[PDB]
Design a protein around this ligand. Structure first.
Ligand SMILES: Nc1ncnc2c1ncn2[C@@H]1O[C@H](COP(=O)(O)OP(=O)(O)OP(=O)(O)O)[C@@H](O)[C@H]1O
Ligand SMILES: Nc1ncnc2c1ncn2[C@@H]1O[C@H](COP(=O)(O)OP(=O)(O)OP(=O)(O)O)[C@@H](O)[C@H]1O
Ligand SMILES: Nc1ncnc2c1ncn2[C@@H]1O[C@H](COP(=O)(O)OP(=O)(O)OP(=O)(O)O)[C@@H](O)[C@H]1O
Ligand SMILES: [Mg+2]
Ligand SMILES: [Mg+2]
Lengths: 1095, 67, 384
């Protein structure tokens, strides 16, 4: 407790020491302060260091210890590298002291591996035996050197056929050896086959060259690997040539990464990168999304024996953050790629130009030190800077010319998908790779050409790679043939299509290509039964599609109309998965736009340069630490149930793609485990860029997954669960919901004019909830009446619920018209619902006889809480109170001065169960104002819960003018989304502390003017579908005169001799009001607004 | 100068108070001051609800804003 | 450029219409009218000077017609070096469009003046503080200062620079802005000498400018590269016909191509120069990297095939021919010969079509619109 305070007060003072600690081992710049403390502390354990090798290096997973001595390292892919000489460890040795030794020892070990592997291969040894001896990197480099030498020898003459046949034999031998090898050897051979196929392509191209000059020109364009024979410095004995220029191999451990197929675009990009690095410039790639830019940069780094460090740029990267990252990468000597470099602010882009130019100049003139950010730091001569950017997308700025002139740009508009597909299929083992790849490419082009022009249809390289990825685990159940490809195509591409596009897809699949899941459908049905849904064909199909998509893709997008079935779909599927597999499920739901970007990810306390985790960062870090071992065997789902703002979402571009790394401004690198999946629940894709649509698998909801009957059944079986009475009541209510009679009512309600238009499919919740609550509230008086009377009362209650749930947002004319249809479609034998039907304590009566004549005092006209009871006032108060008591949100809409506040306050005044918290919404309202209005009314009780200060009365939020708050530049409102979260999820995240707060006894009502009034803003239906809507129009002129005659009588009680004149004064007043409203309209002046408030 | 000024004015007129100004420990300071002033007038108000409802009533009585 | 032509035409008119007679005014005015497509009709020529203008207009050499006024009357031009040299002020403002920068001109000027240049971009508070400290030091110890993208810090510009410029000898201060950015404070602007940076609109002028900034094969290759750069930059201005889009080529491409040529010549001593390798490299990596279309890559490839064919006698443009160097010359002799070849060349009035290998009719519409804008603006100015 207080000891933690004493530790914290000195923890902040340690930062000035941690910064100078990073100056000794520069790779500490990739670690947070909380990890630096653990590394320094572990003087004797030496095991805390082995947990961070991935952050510091990238390709190293853990150290291998043997009795206080370093023996070797283990790559991420499980490969083992043994050091030439073990590093003997002493207790007094600080972490940096032996880390700096290990860094060089790894390089020496890699060089020794390469040297003796090359020596063995030069003696006629075949490639199929050395794969069991050395790491993949050594075999790769030695094979490249020998291929270069032999191709040069063959270039000395015109003979290429012999070497080509030797290469083909080697390829066939490796392909056959692939089957009978372990996992590690399988990875080694699979990575080697890519380079051998590249060798074969180059040799064939040389073989087809007509003359020597053409062959020399072709040879000058590919990468050549040489080796000096004079230098005694081993680490600089290998260089790489392409188009005349030279670069130096670094002999740094890379592991066994996934390797790209050598395509012409890749080689031309290699040439541009070499040409730019020759003069110590930067390298730039630009083009559309998903064309290989980042991955080709990483491959270029791999071929030069070094791991490329990738940062995901963002607007939160201010000048100091970028400059500090530059200081880190310049001291380390690494190759930093700044992906999505456009996403920075224009000002920061202008500001970092001097730093970039300074780095370039220091590299060119061979300076030793560079002064970025007020301190002179050393400059390693191995650094390089790369940027990749997407021109012309949403939420991206433009590089100033003084910065553009510091890079060399290359366009990567269109990759060669045919070669990639063919080579990947050939390696994967398919018998007919060429025809299959050509068919896949042709089919993808046909889809992109013939299908509808939906804004989210992309069939580029990422789609092809996903299709290929789905083929690896399908070969066992379908065979390496056309069937596997077709089924994977259905598995990947179909879930994203519309209605007609599905038919087009089927037709094209039939034309181009020639041609058991019971264990999971049983689990799906069990889950649906537990949650009470109905497993129709559409719902089951969507569930199966979601199940098969998540099997290989770690991030899914669920798009569909409001209330179409997204949340039910993924909740049911994850429950079924938990039943099927036995793995626990941990679910976090985040309403994205409610939180700011700083609360979502984090923010540096610039007064201290101290990092503070955001909500998502905290969740990811807590999962990665895994203190208690809980998250070992669980699936973790993070649901982003909000709009897809580009600026909120593209900060996870590195998270979503193959990098699987969250990059933070302070340099931290939190990995994404395979059991950490991310969901995007949304209703439109208007502002989403193709950069994120291509990264995630997409599931499109073309229509509702449910029928009205099954939805009503689910709602009834849910409302019953919240209660001998039940067995009879369920039968009675389920009988009274006769869908044959109900469907006509539902389709007839569509012709009415609805303010704040909400689909009829979304009002069934209100109807069912209100009906069940009303029926339950009379259960005491059900023991002592016949079947006919019970049926009549239940029918009347249900008719009232239908009337106020389907037509409640329409004028009194429309309501009166709709009552007739409701009466006629239930049959005329049943109890008739009238305009003012009511139940009295039991008999049926009307509101008309219940009007209480009132006589105000003269002085009572000044009290703002005096309401003159009329028929409309009584009816509205009764319905509003009934809706409030049903624990359902309410929105009251009407023109100004109609009286919404009047009825609300009058209904809640005479009650001892509720309190009112008046909150006002203006054009610029934040959630902080809402939380501030609750401070004096609520308590924080602990997880964390928020309760009213009282223990008896519930709390009601009078939220008026909810149309007013403005939309941001991407068409979303913070406050309305917050209210939606409050009603739907009954909770919210406490942003500065990352905790979930549960709302206990707080109801929410709203008040607003029609959206046609000036300055009013449309509302997301995802918000309005949770609230019952009542329209409340102006009283009639007769009603107005009847109301104000009572006021004038009360006033004229002061002047009795003129009491006979009360009626003409009221008539004159209402006539003046009507005439003023008619003449001086808002078409003359904007403020010519009149209402009964003037009366 | 800024829209936040107009938002504060909207809150002040729509309600009879600005909840943003009074919270944290300022709420407790205001509660102490209201206790003292209410005792000085011989009025018996104990619960925080009565105190603040008297606060907002006094504000509603004794504040006129002219634009 | 357009306002340069408008100013030249208007000032020529303002001078001649007073000095010359009335029939001269009628002739020149109807010439401007037929250029502006407002009135049509042959001028009633009797002088000698207007004969060339009439020839330009009849043969639809609109650009030459526009340049006729400047060529006839005004006998001098000023570059940035002249402006900085021949000015009493100490503050300069250089404006440009987007997609073009000219700080390298200032760096060249600083090297030619044996000064010290401090390039300080303005994006953030740290840069602003550094700029304040540097200005304070440099007003005492001398030295040049360049402020880049001053429109990213408009508040600081409006307060600190305003107060400072409002209130040593070897101290000069430059400021680069954008012609399409936010408005700068007019009082601050008036205290500084203003220069607009842009590329040379000619073709031989560009070759001469590039050539005047530099074994014998290095000189020959540099001459060829200068011709290629001028040709391609001139072609970039015809957005529907010369290219399919609007591209921009600058000093960095020239420097990279020059470095590649030097490396090829140095590392391949046979003097059997792989002209095919040079062609492909310059067409794809150096000048073709920016290009994302395929037709425009084909256009660049065709230009490279024409220029870098590597033949003994090359007719670079339909007028002149370049003999490749002998085996018994010196670098100075080669420079002299190539400078002579450049000097003797005369640019025809139809350069945009004859030198870029383009159909004349396509160029005609572009030239016609360009001349129409200037002529109509001059007519508007001259009626008040
Ligand atoms: N030559 C190749 N061989 C195999 N796979 C490739 C090749 N080039 C790209 N890919 C794959 O295609 C996808 C390209 O994604 P990548 O991140 O490289 O694109 P990007 O240009 O960075 O996109 P964005 O602009 O959206 O970031 C990845 O799945 C990558 O592995
Ligand atoms: N298979 C089903 N059987 C019965 N009712 C269903 C079924 N699927 C959905 N529903 C009903 O549909 C309602 C709509 O809520 P749902 O969770 O589907 O919203 P959603 O699709 O996430 O939309 P949004 O979150 O945008 O409001 C659920 O409350 C549920 O009652
Ligand atoms: N039956 C009635 N008894 C008393 N007053 C009535 C009655 N009918 C209408 N009024 C008058 O109508 C006015 C209603 O104003 P109120 O603020 O309640 O309207 P509102 O619907 O909340 O409008 P706003 O959008 O401005 O909040 C009051 O001045 C009230 O006196
Ligand atoms: Mg990328
Ligand atoms: Mg939902």
């Amino acid at each position: 407790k207080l000891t933690i305070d004493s530790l914290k007060m000195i923890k902040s003072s340690l930062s000035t020491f941690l910064e100078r600690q990073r100056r000794q081992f520069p790779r500490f710049y990739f670690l947070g302060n909380d990890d630096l403390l653990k590394i320094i502390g572990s003087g004797k354990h030496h095991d805390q260091v082995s947990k961070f090798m991935k952050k510091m290096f990238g390709s190293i997973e853990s150290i291998i210890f043997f009795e206080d001595s370093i023996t070797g390292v283990r790559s991420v892919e499980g490969e083992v590298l043994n050091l030439n000489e073990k590093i003997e460890l002493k207790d007094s040795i600080q972490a940096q002291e032996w880390l700096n030794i290990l860094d060089t020892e790894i390089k020496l070990s890699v060089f020794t591996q390469f040297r003796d592997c090359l020596g063995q291969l030069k003696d006629g040894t075949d490639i199929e035996v050395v794969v069991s001896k050395y790491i993949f990197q050594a075999i790769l480099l030695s094979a490249q050197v020998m291929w270069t030498e032999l191709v040069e020898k063959c270039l000395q003459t015109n003979e290429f056929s012999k070497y080509w046949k030797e290469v083909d034999m080697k390829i066939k031998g490796l392909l056959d050896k692939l089957n009978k090898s372990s996992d590690n050897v399988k990875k080694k051979i699979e990575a080697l086959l890519v380079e051998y196929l590249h060798f074969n392509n180059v040799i064939g191209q040389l073989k087809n060259c007509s003359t020597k000059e053409e062959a020399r020109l072709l040879w000058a364009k590919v990468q050549k690997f040489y080796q000096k024979n004079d230098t005694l410095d081993d680490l600089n004995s290998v260089f790489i040539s392409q188009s005349g220029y030279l670069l130096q191999y670094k002999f740094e451990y890379i592991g066994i990464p996934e390797r790209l197929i050598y395509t012409p675009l890749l080689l031309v990009g290699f040439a541009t990168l070499t040409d730019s690095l020759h003069q110590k410039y930067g390298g730039c790639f630009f083009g559309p999304a998903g064309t290989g830019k980042t991955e080709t940069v990483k491959a270029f780094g791999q071929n030069l024996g070094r791991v490329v460090v990738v940062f995901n740029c963002d607007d939160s990267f201010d000048y100091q953050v970028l400059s500090r990252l530059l200081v880190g990468i310049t001291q380390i000597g690494a190759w930093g790629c700044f992906d999505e470099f456009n996403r920075l602010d224009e000002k920061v882009l202008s500001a970092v130009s001097a730093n970039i130019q300074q780095i370039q100049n220091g590299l060119q003139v061979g300076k030793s030190h560079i002064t970025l950010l007020e301190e002179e730091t050393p400059l390693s001569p191995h650094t390089a800077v790369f940027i990749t950017l997407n021109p012309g997308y949403n939420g991206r700025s433009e590089l100033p010319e003084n910065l553009k002139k510091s890079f060399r740009e290359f366009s990567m508009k269109s990759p060669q998908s045919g070669t990639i597909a063919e080579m990947i299929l050939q390696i994967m083992g398919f018998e007919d790779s060429k025809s299959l790849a050509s068919k896949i490419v042709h089919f993808l082009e046909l889809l992109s050409s013939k299908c509808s022009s939906m804004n989210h249809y992309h069939f580029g390289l990422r789609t092809l790679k996903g299709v290929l990825r789905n083929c690896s685990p399908l070969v066992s159940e379908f065979g390496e043939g056309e069937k596997t490809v077709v089924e994977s195509l259905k598995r990947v591409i179909l879930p994203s299509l519309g209605d007609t596009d599905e038919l087009v897809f089927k037709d094209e699949l039939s034309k181009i290509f020639d041609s058991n899941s019971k264990a999971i459908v049983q689990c799906l049905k069990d889950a649906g039964q537990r949650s009470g849904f109905s497993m129709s064909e559409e719902f089951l199909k969507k569930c199966m599609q979601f199940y098969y998509m998540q099997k290989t893709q770690q991030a899914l997008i669920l798009v569909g109309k409001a209330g179409c079935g997204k949340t039910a779909t993924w909740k049911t599927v994850i429950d079924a998965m938990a039943i099927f597999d036995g793995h626990a499920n941990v679910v976090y739901v985040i309403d994205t736009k409610v939180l700011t970007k700083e609360s979502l990810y984090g923010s540096m306390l610039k007064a201290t340069l101290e990092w503070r985790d955001g909500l998502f960062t905290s969740i990811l870090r807590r999962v990665n630490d895994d203190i208690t071992g809980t998250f070992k065997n669980s699936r973790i789902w993070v649901v982003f149930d909000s709009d897809l703002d580009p600026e909120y979402v593209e900060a996870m571009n590195s998270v979503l793609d193959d990098n699987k790394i969250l990059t933070l401004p302070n340099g931290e690198r939190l990995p994404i485990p395979p059991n950490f999946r991310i969901l995007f629940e949304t209703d439109n894709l208007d502002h989403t860029t193709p950069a994120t649509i291509t990264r995630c698998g997409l599931l499109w909801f073309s229509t509702d997954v449910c029928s009205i009957s099954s939805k009503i059944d689910h709602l009834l079986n849910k409302s019953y669960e919240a209660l001998f009475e039940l067995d009879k009541l369920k039968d009675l209510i389920s009988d009274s919901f006769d869908m044959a009679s109900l469907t006509n009512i539902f389709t007839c309600s569509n012709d009415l004019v609805h303010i704040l238009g909400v689909r009829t499919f979304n009002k069934l919740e209100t109807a069912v909830q209100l009906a069940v609550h009303l029926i339950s509230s009379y259960r005491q008086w059900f023991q002592n009446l016949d079947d006919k009377s019970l049926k009549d009362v239940i029918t009347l209650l249900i008719k009232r619920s239908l009337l106020y749930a389907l037509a409640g947002d329409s004028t009194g004319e429309s309501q009166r018209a709709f009552i007739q249809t409701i009466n006629t479609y239930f049959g005329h034998d049943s109890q008739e619902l009238s305009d003012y039907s009511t139940i009295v304590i039991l008999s049926f009566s009307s509101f008309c006889s219940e009007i209480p004549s009132v006589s105000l005092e003269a002085h009572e006209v000044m009290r703002p809480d005096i309401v003159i009871p009329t028929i409309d006032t009584i009816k509205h108060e009764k319905i509003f109170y009934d809706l409030l008591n049903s624990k359902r949100g309410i929105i009251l809409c009407g023109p100004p001065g109609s009286g919404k506040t009047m009825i609300m306050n009058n209904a809640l005044r005479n009650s001892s169960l509720y309190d009112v918290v008046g909150i006002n919404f203006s054009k610029d309202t934040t959630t902080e104002h809402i939380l501030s209005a609750l401070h004096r009314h609520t308590n924080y009780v602990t997880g964390l819960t928020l309760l009213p200060k009282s223990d008896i009365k519930n709390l009601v939020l009078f939220c008026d003018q909810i149309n007013l708050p403005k939309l941001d530049k991407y068409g979303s409102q913070n406050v309305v989304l917050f209210l939606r979260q409050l009603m739907e999820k009954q909770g919210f995240w406490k942003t500065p502390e990352n905790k979930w707060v549960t709302i206990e006894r707080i109801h929410i009502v709203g008040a607003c003017n029609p959206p046609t009034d000036p300055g009013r803003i449309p509302m997301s239906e995802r918000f309005t579908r949770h609230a019952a809507i009542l329209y409340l129009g102006y009283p009639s002129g007769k009603s107005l005169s009847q109301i104000y005659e009572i006021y004038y009588k009360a006033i004229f009680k002061l002047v009795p001799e003129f009491r006979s004149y009360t009626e003409p004064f009221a008539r004159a007043s209402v006539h003046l009001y009507n005439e003023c409203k008619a003449r001086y309209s808002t078409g003359l002046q904007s403020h010519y607004l009149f209402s009964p408030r003037e009366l | 100068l800024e829209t936040a000024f107009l938002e504060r004015m909207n809150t002040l007129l729509a309600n009879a108070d600005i909840p943003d100004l009074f919270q944290g420990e300022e709420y407790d300071k205001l509660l102490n001051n209201l206790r003292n002033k209410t005792r000085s007038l011989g009025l018996l108000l104990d619960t925080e609800q009565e105190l603040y409802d008297w606060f907002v009533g006094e504000i509603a009585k004794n504040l006129h804003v002219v634009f | 450029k357009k306002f340069k032509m408008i100013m030249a035409m208007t000032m020529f008119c303002l001078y001649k219409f007073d000095i010359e007679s009335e029939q001269y005014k009628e002739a020149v005015l109807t010439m401007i009218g037929v250029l502006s497509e407002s009135s049509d009709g042959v001028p009633k020529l009797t002088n000698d000077d207007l004969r060339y203008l009439w020839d330009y207009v009849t043969t639809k050499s609109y650009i030459s017609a526009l340049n006729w006024f400047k060529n006839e009357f005004f006998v001098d031009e000023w570059n940035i070096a002249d402006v900085v040299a021949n000015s009493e002020n100490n503050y300069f403002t250089m404006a440009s469009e987007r997609d073009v920068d000219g700080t390298f001109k200032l760096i060249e000027l600083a090297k030619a003046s044996k000064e010290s240049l401090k390039i300080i971009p303005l994006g953030s508070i740290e840069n602003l503080n550094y700029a304040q400290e540097e200005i304070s030091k440099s007003k005492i110890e001398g030295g040049w200062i360049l402020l880049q993208n001053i429109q990213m810090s408009l508040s600081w510009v409006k307060t600190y620079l305003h107060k400072h410029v409002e209130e040593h000898e070897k101290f000069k201060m430059f400021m680069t802005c954008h012609l399409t950015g936010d408005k700068l404070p007019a009082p601050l602007l008036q205290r500084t000498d203003r220069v607009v940076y842009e590329d040379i609109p000619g073709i031989l002028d560009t070759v001469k400018d590039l050539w005047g900034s530099q074994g014998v094969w290095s000189v020959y290759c540099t001459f060829l590269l200068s011709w290629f750069h001028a040709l391609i930059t001139a072609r970039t201005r015809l957005v529907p016909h010369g290219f399919s889009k609007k591209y921009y080529f600058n000093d960095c491409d020239f420097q990279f191509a020059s470095v590649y040529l030097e490396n090829v010549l140095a590392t391949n001593s046979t003097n059997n120069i792989p002209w095919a390798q040079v062609r492909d490299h310059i067409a794809t990596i150096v000048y073709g990297g920016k290009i994302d279309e395929e037709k425009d890559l084909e256009v660049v490839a065709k230009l490279c095939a024409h220029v870098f064919c590597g033949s003994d006698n090359l007719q670079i443009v339909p007028g002149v021919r370049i003999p490749q160097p002998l085996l018994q010359q010196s670098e100075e002799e080669e420079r002299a010969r190539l400078t002579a070849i450049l000097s003797n060349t005369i640019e025809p009035a139809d350069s945009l079509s004859s030198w870029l290998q383009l159909p004349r009719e396509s160029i005609l519409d572009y030239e016609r619109l360009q001349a129409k804008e200037v002529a109509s603006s001059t007519e508007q100015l001259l009626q008040e």
